[PDB]
Write a protein that binds this ligand. Structure first.
Ligand SMILES: *[C@@H](CCCC(=O)O)C(=O)O
Ligand SMILES: *[C@@H](CCCC(=O)O)C(=O)O
Ligand SMILES: *[C@@H](CCCC(=O)O)C(=O)O
Ligand SMILES: *[C@H](CCCC(=O)O)C(=O)O
Lengths: 303, 301, 303, 304
C-alpha cells in the first residue's frame, strides 16, 4: 500500500509488535510465529510491526528480516505490515529495499549504530533511507538518534513518504513541541517500554495511539485499556494500571533487556513456542517466569 | 489555615512563585517585593509561594525566609502564602517553625542539600520536618530527592498535614504511578521551571494544576493559556506555545540558571525593581534582555 | 597559619576526614569526637578536615561547625585543621568567618546548594567567599559545582589564598588539564569516595595526595597503602585493593549514602562512640555491620 | 599470528587506527588508503586496526570490511593488522570469520547494537564471537557494552584467544579493578577519544599502552608524546598537551562525531585524499578545517 494509506492505518487503532520466534538452536521458527500472529489477528490491531525491537530486530541478520516479514504477511490478513529497519545508511538502505520487495507496507527506522551524531548527519542518514524506497517511513527517536523539531520538519518537507514518528525518549517537553510544530503532517506513536504507563500523558501531548508490547500475550487486556483510554474512562485505566501494569513493571525492572524478555516469556506462558531470546538478552529465571504466570492469572489462554 | 484548607486552595487554580527582590548591594527589598506581589494577587492566583525556587530560595539565609513571607502576607489578600523550606533536616525544621510563626499557610519542602540519599533516609527527613509544624506540607520531587510512590504513600499515612506533591523531574512515568496510587489523598502540582510546556501531558497524568514562573511578568498571558487548557481549547494553547513559550525556551536554554534569571529579567522589564540575581546565577546580557523585551511586546506594561 | 603554610601541609602526607559523632538524641558529642580524633592523630596524617562531607557537613547546622572545629583543634596536636564550608554565597561567608575566628587553618568549600550554574556565576560565588577570609581555601569539584581550567585560573589570579583543589568528579580528562595548566600554583587532592581505588591513577594525573575516609577506622591499612603507593610498590597496593577495597566497595554500594554510613559503621566497630548518621543518610543494617566486621578482621582495634 | 603473538605485538608500542578513505561517492578508496597506511608504516606502530571506530566501522557494510583489511595488509609490512568487528552476535560472527579468512591477526569487538544488556548476555554474546575464530580477540568497554571485572574473568577462563581489553568509558575506578583482577592475563589498551589526554593516569592504572587517533595525521608528534610518557618526561608530555592536545580538544568538541571527523580532516590536510565521512557523521566546515590546519602548523607534511 502507499504512504498515505499506511499513515491512515497507523491512526486507526492499537499497534502491536510481535516477538520473533526462535527454535532451541536460535533460528527463526516460522511455523510458531505464524501461529502466534494468526492468534493476534483475531484481536484486530490495524498495524503489525514485524521485527521491531520487541521482535529483536537488533539481533537479526539482515537476510533474516525479509523472511520474518513474509511469514507475518501470510496470516496477517487485512493488517498493514511494517518492518523494522536500522543500522547505518548502507545496511539500512539494503534492508529497506529487501522488505519493500516482499511487500512490506512501510518501515520503522530504528537508530543508527554506536555513535552520537550531529543533527545535520541524522537528517542526511534518514533522508537517504527514505529516498531508497517508495513505501511509508516511520522515524524513531531514541538513544543515539533524537531528532529535534526543526530537523524533523526539514525531513518531512523533503520526504513525502515520511508519515510517522515513534517516540522512545520519554521527553514530554520535546514530543509536545514536535506535535505542535508538525500537526497532522505526521501520525504520532507512543513507543516507550510498556507504553500504557505513558498513554494518558501522551494523549495530552497529542499521541492517540502507541505500541503495546503486552498485547503479545494479553491482547484482550491491552484492547480494554486502549478503549478505556479513548473513551475517557479514567477509573478503568487506573484499575488496569494498578492491577496489571505496575506489577508487570516490577518484573520488567529486575534486569536489563526484560522489556523484551518478560514479553516473550509471556508469549511462551500463553502456550506459543516463541523460544529463547538471542544473546545478549537473557531469558527470565524460573522464579521470574512463575511471578509472571501468577500475574497473568485470570487472563491465561490455557490451563 | 489548616492543612486541608491549603490543600483546597492549592488545587483551585494557577499557581505562582514570585521572584525575590534585591537592592544593588544585595539585601532583600521589601517595598519593591510588596508592590510586585500585590500586582500579582490582582491577577487572582489562589496561592503564592514566597522564596521558592524561582524566588531563589537556594540563595537565601535561613533568617531571610520569614521576612519575605511576612512581606508577601502584608499584601497577598485572599491569596494564601506558602513558604519555601529546605536544606538538611536540622535547618529545615528551624526554617519551618520560623515561617509558621509569621503565619505561613504552608511549606514547600525543597530537596535536602548535596547528597544522594536512600528512600528510607528521605522518609526520615521529610517525616521529621512535617511533624515539627501544624500547617500543610507539599513535598517536591527533583534532583537528589525523588520519592518513590510507596515511600510517598508511607509518609501520607504517617503525616496527615502532608497534602501536596510538586514535580520537577519530568519523569512522566513515575508521576502517573504516584497519582494512580495516592489518588485524592494529595493535590498534584506541575513544577517544571517552564511548566506550560508540560501542562497538557501533566493533566493527562492526573495533575490537579501547575505553577507558572512566567506569570511573574506576563500574568495575563499565563492566565490565558491556563483557561484554554481547562476548557480544552487545544488550538489556543498551541498558538501561545508556538509564539511565546518555545521562543522563551530558546532564550532560557542559552545559559544555566536562566529558568530563574530570565523570569527575573522579565519582571524588571515590566517596571518592578526586582534587582539582580545573587551568585552563582547570572543575569541576562543586554542582548538577551532585548530578545525577551521583543518577545513580551504586546504584553508590555 | 598563613595560606602558603596550610598549602605546604596539605601536600606533605595523607589526609582524612573524621566522621562527626552525634549522641543518640542527635546532638554533637564532643567527648567522643576528641577521643576518636586523638587516636587518629597518632597515625600522623598532617592535615585534618573537620566537618567535611565524610563528617556530614551537609547535615550540620551552621552553628555546630565552629564548635566541631574547636573540638577538633584541642586534641589535634600540631596536625593542621581545615573546616568544611558551603551552601549559597551568603551562608558560606558566614560559615567561613565563624570558623576562622576559632583557629581554622583553612577551608574546604563544598558546592553551593541545589542549582546548576554558569561558570561566571561559580566564579563570582567562589571569589567573594575567598575574599571574606584570610586563611587558605581549597575548592571542591563535584556535582553542581565543576570548575573548568580557565575559570579556575582566573580565580587563582584574583585570590592568593586559594591554594588547594579537591576533585570529586572522577573526570580524568578535566583534572589532568587542570594540573597541566595550573602547575604548582595549586595542591591537588584526590577526593573520590574511597579514593584509594583512584590514587594510582591520580598520581599519574599529577595529584600530590588524596584523602582516605577509611583512615577513620583502619588507619593502619591507609598508611600501609599510601606508603606502598609512594615507594612504587604496586604489588602491595594491589593486594590491599583486592583484599580490602573492592570488598568494602561491594558493601558501600549496597545503598546510597553509604560512602559515609559504612565509614561511620567502621568507626563504631573499632569502638569509638560515633553513633548514628543524621537523616537523610541511614545506617547499615546489622547484617551489613556483620559484613563489615568480618572484613576489618585482623585490623580490628584491640584492647 | 596466533593469540599470544598478537598479545605481544599489542603490548610493544603505540597503536593506531587508520581512517577509512572514501571517494566522493562514498565508496571505499583503496589507492589512497594503502598510500596513507604505507606512510604510517614508516613510523613503526606495531599494530594497525583496520576498520575500527576511527575507521568508521559503524558505517561500513560487512562485506566491505574484508576488502579494507586486505588493502591495509598489502602495505603494512610486519605490522600486526587487527580488524574491527561488531553488532549483534550473528553479524559479528560472520565478520569475524570473513576477516580471519583474509588473514587478519586479530579482531577488536565493538559493542553490540542498540540495547542495554545484562552481564550474562554480554558474557554469552562475546563468548560466542570468540569461539567462532582462532585468532586473537580484543574486547572493548564502551557505551551499551561495559563488562564488569567478574564477567571478564569468566570470559578469560573460558576463551584463551581473548587476549586484550580496550577502554572507552574513562571509568578509572572500574579499569583499575579490571587490571588488578586479571593481571597479565590481558594486555590493556587505552581507548578514549584523544587518549593522550588520559595516557598518564591510565599507565598509573596499569594500562599496557594506548591508541592515538591523531597519529593518523601527526604521527611524529604522537610518537614523541609516547616516548616521553614511557621515559617519565612529564614536562615534555605537558608541553605537548598544552600546545597541541587541548587546542585539538577544543576543535573536536564543536560538534558530535568530530572525534572521527576532525582526525579525517587532519589526514586530508596532510595531503592524503581520505575523502568525506559517511552520514551520520558530518565533515568539518571550511572554517574549522582552517583552525585545524593552523594548529598542525610546524608539523605539516606538505605545502599546498
Ligand atoms: C518499539 C515498541 C516498544 C514497546 C515496548 O517496549 O513496550 C519497538 O519495539 O521497536
Ligand atoms: C518550583 C518550580 C515553580 C516554577 C514556577 O514558578 O511555576 C520552584 O520554583 O520552587
Ligand atoms: C578506538 C580508538 C579510539 C581513539 C580515539 O578516538 O582517539 C577505535 O576507533 O576503535
Ligand atoms: C571529601 C571526600 C572523601 C571521600 C572518600 O575518600 O571516601 C569530603 O568528604 O569532603
Amino acid at each position: 500500500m502507499d504512504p498515505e494509506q499506511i499513515k491512515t492505518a497507523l491512526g486507526s487503532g492499537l499497534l502491536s509488535f510481535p516477538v520473533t520466534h526462535f527454535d532451541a538452536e536460535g533460528r527463526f521458527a516460522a511455523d510458531s510465529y505464524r501461529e502466534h500472529v494468526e492468534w493476534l489477528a483475531g484481536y484486530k490491531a490495524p498495524v503489525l510491526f514485524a521485527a521491531g525491537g520487541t521482535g529483536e530486530f537488533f539481533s537479526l541478520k539482515p537476510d533474516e528480516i525479509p523472511t520474518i516479514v513474509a511469514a507475518a504477511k501470510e496470516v496477517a490478513g487485512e493488517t498493514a505490515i511494517v518492518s523494522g529497519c536500522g543500522y547505518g545508511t548502507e545496511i539500512a538502505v539494503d534492508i529497506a529495499r529487501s522488505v519493500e520487495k516482499v511487500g512490506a507496507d512501510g518501515i520503522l527506522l530504528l537508530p543508527h549504530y554506536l555513535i552520537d551524531a550531529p543533527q545535520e548527519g541524522l537528517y542526511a542518514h534518514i533522508k537517504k533511507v527514505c529516498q531508497s524506497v517508495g513505501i511509508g517511513v516511520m522515524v524513531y527517536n531514541r538513544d543515539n538518534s533524537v531528532l529535534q523539531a526543526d530537523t524533523l520538519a526539514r525531513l518531512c518537507d523533503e520526504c513525502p513518504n515520511l508519515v510517522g514518528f515513534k517516540d522512545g525518549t520519554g521527553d514530554i517537553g520535546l514530543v509536545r513541541q514536535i506535535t505542535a510544530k508538525m500537526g497532522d503532517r505526521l501520525m504520532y506513536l507512543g513507543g516507550m517500554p510498556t507504553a500504557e504507563l505513558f498513554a494518558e500523558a501522551y494523549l495530552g501531548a497529542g499521541f492517540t495511539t502507541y505500541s503495546s508490547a503486552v498485547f503479545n500475550f494479553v491482547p484482550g487486556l491491552a484492547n480494554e485499556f486502549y478503549a478505556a483510554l479513548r473513551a475517557g474512562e479514567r477509573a478503568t485505566c487506573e484499575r488496569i494500571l494498578v492491577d496489571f501494569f505496575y506489577p508487570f513493571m516490577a518484573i520488567r525492572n529486575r534486569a536489563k533487556g526484560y522489556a523484551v524478555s518478560a514479553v516473550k516469556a509471556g508469549v511462551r506462558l500463553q502456550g506459543f513456542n516463541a523460544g529463547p531470546v538471542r544473546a545478549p538478552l537473557k531469558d527470565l529465571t524460573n522464579e521470574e517466569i512463575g511471578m509472571l504466570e501468577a500475574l497473568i492469572g485470570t487472563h491465561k489462554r490455557k490451563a
